[PDB]
Amino acid sequence: DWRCARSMHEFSAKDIDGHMVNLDKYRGFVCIVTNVASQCGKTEVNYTQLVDLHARYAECGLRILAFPCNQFGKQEPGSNEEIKEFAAGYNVKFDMFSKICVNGDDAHPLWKWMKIQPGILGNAIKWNFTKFLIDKNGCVVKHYGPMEEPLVIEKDLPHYF
Numbered sequence: 126d127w128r129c130a131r132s133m134h135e136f137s138a139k140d141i142d143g144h145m146v147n148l149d150k151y152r153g154f155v156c157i158v159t160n161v162a163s164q165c166g167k168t169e170v171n172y173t174q175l176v177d178l179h180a181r182y183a184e185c186g187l188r189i190l191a192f193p194c195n196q197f198g199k200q201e202p203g204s205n206e207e208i209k210e211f212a213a214g215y216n217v218k219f220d221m222f223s224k225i226c227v228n229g230d231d232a233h234p235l236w237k238w239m240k241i242q243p244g245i246l247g248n249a250i251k252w253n254f255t256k257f258l259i260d261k262n263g264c265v266v267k268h269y270g271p272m273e274e275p276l277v278i279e280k281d282l283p284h285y286f
């Protein structure tokens with residue numbers, strides 16, 4: 126199963142409108158995969174800067190996959206519809222997915238896989254707005270914790286475009 130995967134492209138997820146998406150559609154694209162929340166203290170900085178990154182690098186093949194998750198201080202308590210409306214107010218044009226879990230046996234297998242990409246202890250997602258940078262082949266090449274503002278990622282992007 127997911128432990129054996131070598132690429133994000135092997136997985137699928139429900140977009141925020143409810144339709145299944147084969148993530149192999151991102152082959153050739155450089156992706157930021159992040160878990161988002163609407164009522165976190167860092168909601169405003171992350172949404173705005175992810176929208177800014179997307180506005181400036183999407184034409185180059187930057188893509189952003191945002192997975193809502195209510196596991197961190199219960200700061201994504203709303204429905205998939207309320208979340209999609211919330212993101213529209215920040216002018217989000219990147220890809221929103223249906224709410225998931227990122228930690229636990231019920232976690233989306235994509236997230237189970239990303240968390241073990243190069244010890245067994247301590248890989249749990251720690252708060253809202255963890256960011257994984259995925260290369261064009263679907264490999265995890267960097268992890269930025271919830272303290273890293275998305276614009277920190279900008280200087281690493283050239284190495285993978």
Ligand SMILES: *CC(=O)NCc1cccs1
Nearest residue numbers: 182183184185186285286
């Ligand atoms: C936006 C864009 O595509 N710029 C040219 C590229 C340089 C490296 C990969 S794409």
